[PDB]
Symmetry: C5
Subunit: 206 residues, 5 copies
């Protein structure tokens, strides 16, 4: 501005879009969940509804630049449409995920992208024994839908889910939450697919 | 990398889109269902809700290339908008199907496309006797909406539906699931239309 | 394909889109309903939900061609966005209609288009007496929203609705179904508007 | 068609879009409601659902033409996207309005536009006493959201709402319906904003 | 209006879009809420639904002009798509916000923009004790999702929410409503993020 505008122009207008990773130049996405609320539980259909936001990080050479060339600009915000983004998907979802945040990411001079969408998800979960002291445990996998391990790998900075933002007066208390990496194989396809498995253990509030 | 982008450009930017099959150059789509959950049953309206993903395969000359000409590239992922896709449709649906996965397909050097959309479908089904030991049986046909047998044929690699991914703690147990090919005639039109008939037999979990 | 692609290109890329009918060059749409299910009935709000598919036919000179010029091609499928389509609308709908089928039509060398969208419609209907043996009767008009009789006419191949595809195990049995043409006048506008009136008579099982 | 296509092209392709009214060149929209059904009433949240269609008229110099120059064409239908339209909005709505009709308007040689969207609206209304003989009364204002009196004025051809199209077998009977013009002031802004206040009085039966 | 068209053309057609604020040229948005109705309360999931409209003001050099050059034009209305707008977001929302108004803003010769979207929001709130005389209190933060304090600051013209437009016959009476500015830090990010905290205290009508 004029610097930022020129920068954005150079990356997006002058180049073709990054065509996604491949076996030859694969990519690693760092996931991390901040759980906000277990909004509702349906014991007649065994689906439960979570609200959270999911931090995604990755890095691309396509998105690098030299700050001195662009008015000492270290980073910028941009629409998620302007860049490639990973197709992280909830495998046991029962309804399409609802986006609760804007679709804007941060890009930085070293090509690192950060993107943190807020979501509401309804996923498969049997709440039997939520009323008990012992509580009930449910799990849901997040991972690329189309990209194998050989193109997209996932990692977590910590197995502990971020519960510091959980709703004080929720109907359900969280006993524990876990974000652990996994490998899976499916009947369609020879290659392994990577996913981060979100496992929550919860119960009704006294 | 550059090597790909060039490929994608050659297939999509330089050519006009494949205009769909015709009697002269017809096409065969291979369908296959992985049932995930029978989410809910409504006995007051006789509609039942399934979550699954539906594997679609087909092949086009339009999409072929020579790997040596494109940096030894065997295959790639792309948006479903970038290519023609078949109009497989649930004939007894009561509500529009909801897409639970991204709209990305895999294309390969020999022109083979694979596309596996995850869906939630509400279809016509009378659950009377779901509580019994015997269970209740329901069926729904999938097939092209507009393309006759003479333009689109359907086939299955197996009559057995893939239940290996079914939800362990679902409200309903699957006794059996079947994907069998069928031929049908409709009053509008002289030609026969092909469909794969999904037949599931299920009951409450006891 | 080479042939078909060229054909499609000539009709759509090289010409401007058909700007809809007018008084001078009017047209006639043939409607026909295949009722599939009466899904639900709400007696607290007097709305009922139907699932069906609605066959639409019409013909345009804009869409004609000579098969010999295009590799003996008699007809083809295409997206509904690529062509003009008629604005048939349910006058007593209480919620926007939901499309249950793809938006693809068939065009033929003589300019005839066929298009059969599958729909779910919620329309105004008082089900009082649906539980009785006598059953209850409800009606809903379908017709162009903006085009008068003088631009769009409607006709039916038969007054009998196609119930051969109705759901065997539906909560409601169909006693009868009727698709009859009508003329209507509205206070806004001098001209008459045409509609096909769908009348169904049904009850619980 | 050739003629019509050329006309449409001249108005839309060759000109930039009408940039909306201003203080200097203000505009008057004529509103008129045809109420179809009071579909449902929720006494636990005090919202009620109406289905109707709302006639909008206005006139622009931008849209004028000479019929002799265009094959004696008096008028035509077109997409609502092709022209500017007014931002009439329900002030006491509790949910986004649902469009039940196509988005097509009629334009005429003297620059007059007519546009009649069918809608379902959920708005704020306490139904307490709907079961009584006396009935209950509710109101909802329609007016531009962003344009003051000084840019958009509203008028009504009649204070009587058009109930001739109301549903015979609705759960609720209409005792009366009124479309009266009003002026309002809001805390944000010095200028007055115009609205047409729809007031309905109704009950069960 | 020949004049207005030319003006609009000069700002939007001839220039590239304002690329959003940065640390170097930051921006201040003035928020203000007019609460219309507390429509419903769900005590089984602890979510409550508000209808309101939210006044947003800010100023940009990009949008300035000289009235003498454009037929003494002081201001104009335009689509929200034609200009940059701030990404104010409800942090404790449980469902995507629904827009109840048109997406039109007012721009003025000194570059000031005003934009007042009407919304329905479902947010996290425990209504326990709404039936009491004492009432129950709930809060929800509004702020940029992606822009730190260093790029977007928020302010309020008054801590008092505008209740003059509240629904006379609502199921719930408003005891008080507050729009107060706040600073927050999140685990992802070193910088502080600004939010205006909407705090309402209410009860059943009795
Ligand atoms: C870029 C993209 N998404 C973000 C999400 C958040 C934040 C910064 C972001 N930056 C913090 C503030 N906004 C909500 C969360 C936490
Ligand atoms: C290409 C395109 N679609 C796919 C869908 C799936 C898989 C691989 C795919 N590869 C497995 C993993 N993702 C969901 C399903 C099963
Ligand atoms: C052209 C356009 N739509 C059609 C819809 C159907 C059919 C033929 C069509 N042809 C029959 C077979 N497919 C579903 C319905 C009935
Ligand atoms: C142009 C635009 N909208 C219209 C809406 C209607 C009519 C004519 C129209 N002409 C009458 C017939 N169609 C529904 C209503 C009433
Ligand atoms: C520009 C943009 N949005 C506005 C919203 C409103 C108003 C003026 C506006 N001007 C007042 C009248 N319309 C609704 C609210 C209050």
């Amino acid at each position: 501005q004029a610097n930022l505008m020129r920068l954005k122009s150079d990356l997006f207008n002058r180049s073709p879009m990054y065509p996604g990773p491949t076996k030859d130049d694969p990519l690693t996405v760092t996931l991390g969940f901040t759980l906000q609320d277990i909004v509702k539980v349906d014991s007649s259909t065994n689906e439960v509804d979570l609200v959270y936001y999911e931090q995604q990080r990755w890095k691309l050479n396509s998105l690098m630049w030299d700050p001195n060339e662009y008015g000492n600009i270290t980073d910028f915000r941009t629409s998620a449409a302007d860049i490639w983004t990973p197709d992280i998907t909830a495998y046991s979802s029962t309804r399409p995920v609802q986006v609760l945040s804007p679709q804007i990411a941060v890009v930085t001079h070293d090509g690192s992208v950060m993107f943190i969408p807020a979501q509401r998800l309804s996923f498969m979960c049997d709440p039997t024994g939520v009323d008990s002291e012992e509580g009930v445990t449910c799990a849901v996998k997040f991972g690329s839908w189309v990209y194998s391990g050989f193109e997209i790998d996932l990692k977590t900075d910590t197995d502990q889910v971020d519960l510091s933002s959980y709703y004080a007066s929720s109907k359900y208390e969280i006993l524990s939450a876990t974000q652990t990496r996994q490998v899976q194989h499916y009947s369609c396809c020879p290659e392994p697919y990577i996913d981060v498995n979100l496992v929550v253990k919860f119960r009704e509030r006294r």
